[PDB]
Symmetry: D2
Subunit: 358 residues, 4 copies
């Protein structure tokens, strides 16, 4: 049973979803990537985009750009590891995409334009059974963070699911062991020192909706907002209105770090917390939550696919010496990598439960 | 008589041309900026963008944002030292712009989207008399570099003119005094090590016309094409087919350097060349061509309004010892600031020549 | 009566303390900078460093390099605006410095090698009557943040004064009015997102005492320690053991931002806190604390000489909506420029007190 | 029969040479690394430097740090792949290093300090049989570029050998096929847009020998000099007084590119030169000279061990269309990694020739 997926928007996350599908062994055997969609249908230019990444390197798979038939002027079929993917043209409305016809059942929505559960339904109107939004979703969609609440999915009810944001996926696992191990956050504020993204600008330009976010990106520390402010309360309803935060966008191109400051419900210590987070990383959060005892800096997490990886030393040293309630917890994440692995983990969970019931 | 100008595209070059008008003492008196055009009309946002620049800092003029009538919702008039500039909404076609209505005669075309003579003429159809494309132009518009061939301008024939590009305004001064002082160039190639611009990308992205241009801009040395390649031959026909070159877009926000390598027409020396450039700096090319004897790096050329500023020490330490024909000439330039100043000098030179005749 | 000073270690803080002295209009008239001490005595090189700064531009003063005698090989005296500062060679011990000879009474200890009280007394034995260390000090030196506790300085008891770090001169204003306006801080942790310094490395290199800190500076978010972790308790005895923090060094050359997360003593609001700080900013903290109501990023604080300028918007927008105990204060600072001005303002304060008593 | 080698200065080149020895299969069987030398004897700090590199990522090999006796305070032995390397304490004179005692015959000198052939013999007085200087040398040390002139090595008389610089290793292959294939280079001039290195400064600071080299590294285009200005004439004497160049140090942490403008000795075409370089890349320069047909940028050459990998499209698109003599040739290089592999290549060659005769 090849899960038939199509990628709408072959950008940073689209191309890293694609690469997490090939690197993890699933192309053409477990998941069938039927088609990819973006502005051009020049498969040679997509191959160029895949083969050479500034931040994550050359990939291990191989890519060819072949035509479907010599009647077409430019290569339109991509051939990865002998698997053929089709380069479909970008549609302004989700519904004008031929999903049903190409036989695509699960569509990964990663353009960034269709974050509303209502516009994303246009995929299903085009023929898709399910939709995963690689972002926070507005308008009613289900937001799941793997390792914390993927089980609340239901094939029957949830058809446009959302995998939250990179920072949610990092914060929430931290929050989830704090509650489940019962330290509890009474209240919590959080900062994500975060790499710049494709929504920012090389030099000072136009950004109407966030004035600061239009400042030259690679030469300014830019205050702005994070997506995990809302979404962690959505995933864990016990933190609704207990926790919020901001974002500082600094001049690195990938990897970010969460910096959570909370107050505990019961009296505890940072040694108890560090123990429970390591334990959790080895037992029930394994693969999603990780930890590190080394003096790592940010470029040591490029290509690290844990959702969140707790920094044991930066935490243990930077807390109040005899504290029972006021705690800092530092944790890292490759905002482009681990998040692209979680999208594929979610597709496959959903396909499993969709077959499990119908 | 105030020159009635309208800036279409209030971006890096739009806002720097504006500020140059204020810093030189022309607003309201010598130059009247009737209107500016961009993706919004919210003048409180153009205020912010004028008041805070990452590279060139805070401006000396004062900016206020007020509403034109109490009927409007967001402040839509700019007021720069008690002079009113209007914030007109952007139009997809130049012909649709109310230029004759607003009373604008000269339009500075700096959107980047209308570098063709004919899409630029839509301005004259919208009620403008003359257009200055802040870029090189296709379709056949007049290309004039100030200090070299601005005298070639005719009020009768040149309605869409072009002030070439930043690199062309840096290299043609140098090429000009080499041809005029009789050293001559037999053939020559050129390289601009240049700052990234707003067409480049924060993280690797789409740029289907120059594939390399699409790669993360601030973490890479990106080879690409320079404007001064086509344009130095248009300005000096003597260099047609004898001079071409490339760009290496490097991770700095502003200022670029030209690295000219040429073979001279007669047997000379680099000290003869160094003295002639210094001479031409102090005599005929003043304010256009400049020079330095100091050990400077790119940050020192921020806000240097010279088109070309020769580096006497880098040229001299990095040429062959007793050479008569093969030489290197190095020359800096603030690609944002000096080019903007030269646009204002062109507007003013055209507007005076037009009055002197009609 | 010119306050006889000499600067030991003319680097970033040494040249910004020097430009602060000249710019405020003090050189020659109120402060006589007798000598500057560094690894060289080539006043031509020192003058290359003064005239061109990558982050703070061309200074307002003029620097000339003169020979004291034609008997010396290279220029060894700096003539800044007609005034003569001598270039004395750098000694490995403060003690062997000719202070008593040169006439120097106040020494600004900005090498960063003699931060302990006792190696700092090495200047006094050698002739200086007073010493200001541009850094937190060990061995029991008096730590003073201007505008918070300079009233505690006594000419009799305190000869080796510490002006604390740049982050404590940013954090200590805000903790001072938070206690003075009785909100009070129960406990609190802080993070500074901070620009890389002279003590960091261009590529991965050696740093034996903090491992992460030797990593490539300009391409990593390097977690580390801050100086305000100790210093704010030395200055504000109330905060002894209630507040600590950490630093994240990010890829910008200058300007940083504190981000304090505290739990207040009483029940309050962020609009209450917002008013209390702004008020304080206009009244008793005017010149030390500042605020902004604008959407500014880090490069808008280059050359802002307030110790701490509070960002009203980023705070109000990024706090929990109806909270009474748990808050986040965000505040900027130009760690090179603001600090240096406090140095010149401590010399000036201490000096007159000494002249008041003896 | 292992070659016994010691590395003095375990910095960027020392650690990359170490990693090229383990990568190429050579550690413990073909080359035995008896000792590494740097500021510390802390095996743990060395292991942290080896395992986490910002640019070249995690090494494939495994590093442990053990104590050589129960008596030593801190781990002083590395155990890379079961092979034990000693951590010898850094010395001020090469001669005070225990090479004969340890049993070291070949010494990779890579501190950046002992670049004089006389200072370098200190190693042979310390007990070593040969010295390789990872940098151009003075005082008459024989200079070799692998792939161009290592056949000029005489076991007999060449004792302290210099492997030239990274730019001579890129430049000399190109210059070598142009003279061997009989295009010739009459006079030539080059420029290398180049990543910053460890001799540079994060923020503006001290640099007495090159004034510009002290300016903040990651925020300027810094003109400077190159090592291949001297060394290529020494490897290829045909080109002494005929070829020279300069350097621009830009904000990338690794990879650099050679922009070479030369005039041929005979009428030829850029198409012809392009074929010759590809041909050479495939036959006698293989593994040393490569080429690319792709639209690559600097980051695509990280971990590319060819010494000089020619850009076919950048060279072909940026030359004069009718030219027969005056050309531009562009070739890339990972200045840390390819040079490191070549140092191992020379040590290996040298050692086999020395065995062959004695
Ligand atoms: N960048 C990150 O680190 C990151 C992390 C987590 C989640 N995400 C989320 O994923 C989404 C996409 O982010 P990204 O960083 O990949 O951006 P991106 O711009 O690099 O990629 C988006 C791609 O969508 C394409 N596209 C736009 N409109 C399209 C359309 N109508 N039809 C087809 N293709 C279209 C664009 O050309 C682009 O290639 C965003 O919602 C973002 O929040 C990004
Ligand atoms: N920045 C430089 O280094 C530089 C130097 C020399 C010449 N130029 C030339 O100037 C032109 C603009 O360059 P820039 O660097 O200012 O870019 P920019 O993107 O900062 O500015 C262009 C502005 O035009 C606006 N715009 C887009 N469409 C518009 C429309 N239809 N109507 C009105 N406004 C519109 C954009 O929002 C933007 O603010 C380019 O063609 C470039 O070649 C730029
Ligand atoms: N840069 C900042 O943001 C900042 C802010 C606040 C305080 N400081 C502090 O000020 C001190 C200097 O820091 P910096 O950033 O200016 O560093 P820097 O390295 O630029 O300045 C140090 C200067 O001292 C010189 N020097 C070294 N040894 C000397 C000696 N023995 N005698 C005389 N001069 C000597 C160096 O050549 C250099 O010019 C440090 O203690 C630092 O903590 C720096
Ligand atoms: N990195 C490049 O791009 C490159 C390319 C070609 C050649 N090289 C040459 O390599 C040499 C070293 O440069 P690098 O880039 O490795 O710099 P680096 O500063 O990273 O390495 C030098 C190492 O030597 C150590 N060291 C200093 N003094 C020592 C001493 N007295 N004894 C023993 N070890 C000592 C330092 O701790 C440092 O780790 C230079 O001569 C350079 O020109 C570098």
């Amino acid at each position: 049973a090849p899960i038939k997926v199509g990628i709408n928007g072959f950008g940073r996350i689209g191309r890293m979803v694609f690469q997490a599908i090939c690197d993890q062994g699933l192309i053409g055997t477990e998941i069938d990537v039927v088609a990819v969609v973006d502005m051009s249908t020049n498969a040679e230019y997509f191959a160029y985009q895949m083969k050479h990444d500034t931040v994550h390197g050359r990939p291990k798979y191989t890519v060819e750009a072949v035509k479907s038939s010599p009647s077409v002027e430019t290569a339109d079929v991509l051939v990865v590891n002998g698997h053929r993917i089709k380069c479909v043209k970008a549609q302004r409305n989700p519904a004008d995409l031929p999903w049903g016809k190409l036989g695509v059942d699960y569509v990964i929505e990663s353009t960034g334009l269709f974050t509303d559960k209502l516009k994303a339904e246009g995929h299903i109107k085009g023929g898709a059974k399910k939709v995963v939004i690689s972002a926070p979703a507005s308008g009613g969609a289900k937001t799941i963070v793997m390792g914390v609440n993927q089980h609340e999915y239901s094939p029957a009810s949830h058809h446009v699911v959302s995998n939250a944001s990179c920072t949610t996926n990092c914060l929430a696992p931290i929050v989830h062991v704090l509650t489940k191990e019962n330290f509890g956050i009474e209240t919590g504020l959080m900062t994500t020192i975060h790499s710049y993204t494709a929504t920012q600008k090389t030099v000072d330009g136009v950004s109407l909706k966030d004035w600061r976010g239009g400042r030259a990106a690679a030469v300014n520390i830019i205050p702005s907002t994070t997506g995990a402010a809302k979404a962690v309360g959505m995933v864990i309803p016990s933190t609704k209105g207990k926790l919020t935060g901001m974002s500082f966008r600094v001049p690195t191109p990938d990897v970010s770090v969460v910096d959570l400051t909370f107050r505990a419900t019961r009296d505890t210590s940072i040694q108890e917390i560090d123990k429970a987070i390591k334990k959790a990383a080895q037992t029930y959060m394994k693969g999603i939550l990780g930890f590190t005892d080394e003096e790592l800096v940010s470029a040591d997490f490029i290509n690290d696919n844990r959702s969140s990886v707790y920094d044991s030393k930066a935490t243990l040293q930077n807390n109040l010496p005899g504290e029972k309630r006021f705690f800092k917890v530092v944790s890292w994440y490759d905002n482009e990598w681990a998040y692209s692995h979680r999208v594929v983990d979610l597709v496959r969970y959903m396909a499993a439960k969709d077959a499990a019931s119908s």
